[model samples]
Target: DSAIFTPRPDGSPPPEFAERRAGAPLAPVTMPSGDEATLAVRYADVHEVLTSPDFSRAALLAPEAPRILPGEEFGEDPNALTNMDPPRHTRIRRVLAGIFSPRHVKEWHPRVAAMTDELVGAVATGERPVDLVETFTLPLPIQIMCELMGVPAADRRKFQLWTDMIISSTAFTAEERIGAAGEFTGYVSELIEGRRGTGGDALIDALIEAHEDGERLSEAELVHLTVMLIMAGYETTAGVLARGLLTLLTTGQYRTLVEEPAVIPTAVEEILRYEAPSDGGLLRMPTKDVRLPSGVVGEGQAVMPSMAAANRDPEVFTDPETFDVRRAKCPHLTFGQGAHYCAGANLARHELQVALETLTRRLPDLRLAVEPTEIEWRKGLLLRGPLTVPVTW
Candidate 1:
């Protein structure tokens, strides 16, 4: 109940963040799993926790590493890129660099826009008081991910279930999580094997080729990477779209976009900054004793740097509570920073840009069908957004 994702009555970050930032930038936090850790709430401290080499993502893979929730321990496979450090992380990232490059992200814009139009068209044509999440938000990224990875579009809904189970830290038992992992890996493995010794246009095919041609990625690494991409790609983008759209529609910023289309790009940035959907970013463990602006963090201690809190740090963003689309110099850490920066950052940006642009131009009269407080937000986990956004045009 005390999770930072739990918002105040006005839908802002909990007052605990402001108290932490003002008092203890590095405060003791008991994770959902009952493990103790240090939480960094300030901007500079969070940035240091993310960018500093002393804090290691790979450390979390250790058997003794602290778990974030009950029944959660180290991943079955530690070879995934998210757990890797230094040269290994660099190599695998390079292999997929071209796939997520700004060039390719821009190249995919037309398709993204087309897909957005189709989804929005469905919402427009369907009955009134439709759920945007069901009609537009959820399907958009899943379809994009399935097509990009050569996964059968028919399997998108199946994977969505798996993705939800995999990320639900406290809700599931150890048996449930293990079963979900097994099922998800089995699906991904079959997809990988089906593309073996065959060349194709899909991104999964490209990854298979890279695995075969290069000794850098093991078979296990390949399978886990594909699963990670699917899960991460589907959840994060969908959360941002649903929550960000809600913010715009509620705050009367939706009309601003329709009136001045030129502000779309800036609006997208602001949305990312204002409605960051990730419950928190990737957790880090200090490799050695280090002194932070707040205090000294010991080696091997679990340190969680909340991007959500950091984005609202008054020291960085002036009037941090206010949502300003035209706010100049918005340098938020929504995508994170340094070595572990999101590989799909560019692609996500393009998707959001097209999504908002298409929505504003196509559905100028779109508005919420229910009171803001009536919206049900996802709970019991880190990442947050509405379960269903009922709307009308």
Candidate 2:
């Protein structure tokens, strides 16, 4: 069984988070790799794990680094930034900084709103009891990412399948992960090569141009970064839509958004807090012996700090368990904190805001088509969301 704590049916994390928060913020656990490591549950401890320079992602890339799954090992993809720290991480992030800046993302909002309108329009006139996950949530992010990356519309369907396979913990065997990575890499390589010289301002073109700068990303770095962007862009936002809608509809909170458009921004933040996309936190390793709130975390020890649980931390959040759309001062760590903060956070928020705003406005009477208990949640992954959200307007 996975060492990670799964959420309850009401979309809250297991009680273990609270129990550990009150007792030991940092405690031992057997990772899925069957290796021993510490789990950090409390808000303060998790914040430290993510923010402290003593905790190193680059260290986890070693040949003998601790694993998160039975077959999981580091250095699987050396070019990915998630496995890097300091100078290299700083350099790569610099290249991406301008692209994801507030100004650049703001330029894309109208397009995002248009996309939301198009998808929600289909649901408005189409058949009842549609699987929103299939028709809207899943496809919307994929399309947006495809547009940003300059991927051909016809190829996105297969790209989605490849991304899903790669991110799953138990959905595929080692061979399958390798196969999907190979196919994805090959596709991206061809896309990059095909777009050379015919430069537009798309992200892929910007990356290709950045690679040409020689001191910046290498060809391999380019490929892996693109893959990371596509995967990150597609899955997390999709999960948010599916889970966010489920949370709103089931709680009879959809009425709130429909009745008041101004509160959509706050509602989106609450949705993120209520159902953080990742099931567990990003894995980190301490570079040296470090003191945590509860105890010492020895050097080279793997630690999983759960942002999902941290968002619900009572010390940080009042009435932490309740889903309050009008939640004031929502400082949740859904996009994470510190250096590894999600680069696509602005883009995701834009999509989510547009999605919820258009959805509630278009279909005010939307509700679940099936019993609440019948919804199936995804398993064997770090991300959390319903497998299918069947609904009718």
Candidate 3:
């Protein structure tokens, strides 16, 4: 969505990258790490590497691992599950997976639906059109995250402040982002301390039990996992949901969904494939010199698997550019694939289904008040959504 590297409507880059653009397969590019590796842009190539074992995120996050990005916020510890490869990423993901399972997410459905209803209800009562982003999108996930984590009512504001800091890429400086990460870690430490001797049903409580039963996680590991979970659970899904609704309305597909509520589930998949809210796929550093379908990849360097491009790959889907809500089920790389597939996939899917169904069912007259181009996407490294989605219904 960013103009700086915005490809042409045909997915071809501008003249600058034309020569270097192999346009053949995913090839290797030089990395800042001085390694002869880094994935060049290609769809099938990106998908292959993402699903390959040669690339490792967990190993890259270890103390001995080569640092791709310069920041303590992402890679600072050896035991951090989000950073670690295979066995460890698997174990930690198992513990955390249940919390984000389809069942647990279904458990959260009523609450999320209730929250959406309240926000939309505000717009209904207001005399003028409102920004759907503010009125319905932003606050829902913030509140849901705190509730899921068992964040105390008294400390809710503090949680929100930390979350806001971590989620803002364009608005915050590097030091500011790192500082917010530290503050968030501290907050989680306190929450863990509070839950140490007690048992609760919240996701945080479950994590605490894992730590307490055995030294399965160090304090740092616990903190890092919790921070990652909060960030993952909060921002990205919310952005997708918000943008998904906006896209449907702007494209005049809202009425069809209203007419046939059964289409909501399939519509969510199309939305994930089309109006992705995040830029840059998950970062993985190569472990060895390996050749992809595109070209030779040198050892020990970074590869960014661009899911946005892969989702639009014509080889996988017919007429990839067009958004078809009823398109046949094919795996989308939106939640990633292989070992590090997003643990929050089920939760995100549940959230999208409930949120979309609720909106189309409740807001029959929903329509974009402003042109699609009028609303600007929030610029950032992580999550994205329109700064304001002006709509009337």
Candidate 4:
């Protein structure tokens, strides 16, 4: 009786996670692949699973390893930065260092702000409602990614389609998924070949700079890394902004933010700590029998660590169930932990903060045009967001 992917209509993790928190912190579960796995629900156990060398992210993608779901292979590629550990992980991260750091996000701030302001500026000022998902929330990150990778405006639609098909489980058929993978791979390989010399601040140019400077990264490694970034760089952040807007509006926190602009920093972290997908992330494999806070997990077995559940651990958070913007202490695992922590987290944070800052500053009167239930949720394992977020000022 294991099903961790049961998302509530409100996009919250299942109440079953709470039930299992105490009685079965390390509960037996069924993967979408129909294989057996251990679901880690407690903060201590989840932290250990993610940080300890007892786990091997690479093994999770080995041919003999269990799949998280069918048609999923982002980390299966040998050179995928997310798929690598130790020497390779260390090597890859070094090349991209400081690009996504706080100093970098600081430099990108004004540009990001301009992007947000223009999108919101285009909306009709009167009472007519606008689907911000279409006009603002969605387009902001798409523009960021397109500009970052120096991709053409026309090509972005194709990139979007490929990511949608590639990230989905039930949303796309097997044929669509397979075809998109091949097309995306072919397109990216050619783009890398074409951009090998001409360099700039965009990610493609940056990587070429690294390789030219003798980074030892192969063309295969470059292709997979680029593919991973293009997909990851935008989708999850878009979802967070979309769902977060709904949460802020529905909970009356949107007005609070407008009234007290000083809270934007904590508010952003609170949002990150508060909102998380119900399921999906890489399935980790323990390399040896390990004793966690809950119990023992045997070697080479799949373990689904729930950062969503851990974020709400009462042991770490005072009154964890409540969503408070002024949360004094927030160390979230949403970006993950240890060697595999999300490299794009700082950039995502900058996007989220700038987005809220723009919303509160420019469209202070913005309010939802319809009930939250009317908004549609996109179907996918990795990326989660509302299809539409209708608002009016």
Candidate 5:
């Protein structure tokens, strides 16, 4: 029987991946929703799919496409940017490709620094044995997106309430998800509408300029893309930082960061590599027969570019399982690869880097309040992180 691609009981990516990499780098596997697809386990094979143009995310979104979840509408929206391919994807993506570019990230750095310091400092002052997930990791991304969209500092909690429901899986009812999504979308819509006629420097304002022309973007794509920026910016980036902190704390590497702040940039990359994404990378279907290091993925066949497994491939990474903060030349695929590579990678990396530095520098004594095993993971979300990393400083 082909094993399903899910996490182990502890919420780690399935060990079945390791077994497959050794025995069968390319193999068949079942998605949670009962769909059969190709599993690329080795680093090179996984890389092949992500780097090659032959993989089509849109093809994986067909009415008859195999899905990993019953309510997966991510593939259904043609204008969602992620659901488009090539010229369409390229044109829409052009507007956003430089929004979070490295140069912009550098300009945004001080603001991010102030934000991280503000949140972590609040955590340090508020209470002991605080849940960092709720206080630090979660809010950092939310606040940044809020600031990016020019949401008033005074009104952020309401924004957070709706955002909370949107990312929650089993924790919120289906009705709650749609309801909050509507509220969040409506809020962003208004935010977009309100920004017009008055020139502004916020990210949404830039999107407005694009929308006015009608040639570069559409109303639906603009809203969808902005909403995606906030949502995508929140859960996964927030999640990885949460998981990154947990790994550092549990592995006794927290102190290393405290003493040697200079290593934080490398530590951030290592943290990203170690946590990776728990359940394979994004799903794609091949447009044509594509050969990889392992074997060929037949045309129209669903395949998961399993970045989580690829990060741990021993052939490329020596002692791949080890979490050495200073791991040299760490070319881990945490941000993914190629044209479809994460648009917010630079911002996410800079945010994570600053977060790690600020936390260690500001609260040198930070440690977990409860045993790691007691920490709850978020339910129903594809990305994984401790729901609450209760910590004391």
Candidate 6:
């Protein structure tokens, strides 16, 4: 109960838990589930687990393994690529890797820019500062994911609510959590079924094609995969966009973006490194005993390294805590590492760069409309982010 999670009321920046991590690995930290134990590691120690085949996320699908969340979900689907170890993980991720490649997502550039322009246009009409998280960041990814998945335009927001509910975990009671997961899976299954025999020109159709060709992504896998992409594509990018803007507005770091839009690209990278949002390390389970830079983590312990912590590790980054838009060669674990590297990295980068560039350029006078301390962050089991970001231009 002393876990940083216990102080649910404040919703502080990533818990001090990582900072408090001793230079050596501490005793395994247990969650509510008596079976699993947490083996927290720092940046240097993380590479050992990330590259080692001895540890696999497949453990999450095991009946005996402890779940990161109490609800049945992406964790429960053994067929989902993320829950699978190599060979299976390799094959499944390979199928959709090209679809999310820089070239494929880059082709949607014009459409992305157009979407940003329209969102900004709507918010520009009001005299007051708008919450960009609601008006801009949230809508951009939800709309794009819908277009790509060929999910019905009218039903997109409903799907988004499900995505939010699932990812915002620990916020809802156990019952509400289960119901939301059911709703999302049910919705996706229905959509997949509707397009199974009939041709629909979208990614779902591509998955259907693969299935027909004997590629064999099971119905559950398809549903979870779609949910994964939507959640992955939307949440991380939205968090970066919101948190990046907050950093800029609060710190006065990107004041030049208003006049010199050319600098926004570089600035966006800095924003990503500083706010690198994958605070909860990839849910991992050790298949064998492992020695790490932090210390020895016994076999079967759940080892996780926060990207937010890793990016801030002083060894990897000089003066890591400070946000420097001009930092040279910032390599962060924000997109993760190894087999599960983010498929949506390029797309997210584009969205952030474009959003920051466009918003600052159009609204030269933009600033936080309210006191920074008053902002309330969204609280939950898996994510770290604000509920809304209100700013004036």
Q: Estimate each model's TM-score.
A: 0.94, 0.96, 0.86, 0.93, 0.94, 0.88
Instruction: Give me the candidate number with maximum lDDT.
Output: 2
Model 1 misplacement above 4 A: 1-11, 73-76
Global fold similarity of model 1 (TM-score): 0.94
Model 4, 1-393: lDDT tens digits are 123467445666677678889788887777767776788888898889888987877776667788766555555677778777777777888766645667765666676777777776777454468888878777778777766777777898788888878777576777788899899989988887787777566667776666666765777777787888888876787788888888898888999899999888888888887787545567788889999988999988788888888888888888888888888898878888887888888888888988888888888988999999987775444555678888887
- Clash counts for all predictions: 2, 1, 3, 0, 0, 0
> What local lDDT score does residue 114 receive in model 1, on the 0 to 100 scale?
76
- How well does candidate 3 score on lDDT at residue 211? 79
Candidate 4: give the clashing pairs. none
lDDT of 4: 0.77
Root-mean-square deviation of Cα positions for candidate 1 versus the true structure, in angstroms: 2.0
Q: Output candidate 2 Cα RMSD.
A: 1.7
* TM-score of candidate 5 against the unseen true structure: 0.94
Pick out the ten consecutive residues of candidate 2 with the lowest summed lDDT: 1-10
Give me the overall lDDT of model 6: 0.70
Q: Write the per-residue lDDT of candidate 6 for residues 124-204, one digit (tens) a residue.
A: 876586787888878887877777777877987887887777665555565775788788778877878777877764566
Model 2, 9-76: lDDT tens per residue? Answer: 54557777788888877888666677666888778888888888898887876778776777753235
lDDT of each: 0.80, 0.83, 0.68, 0.77, 0.80, 0.70
Q: Which residue pairs does candidate 5 place in steric collision?
A: none
Alpha-carbon shift of residue 59 in model 1 (angstroms): 1.6
Worst 10 residues of 4 by lDDT: 1-10
Q: Which prediction has the highest TM-score against the true structure?
A: 2
lDDT of 3 by residue, 99-172 (tens): 57777667767766776677666767885588887666776676667777777667656666777776554456
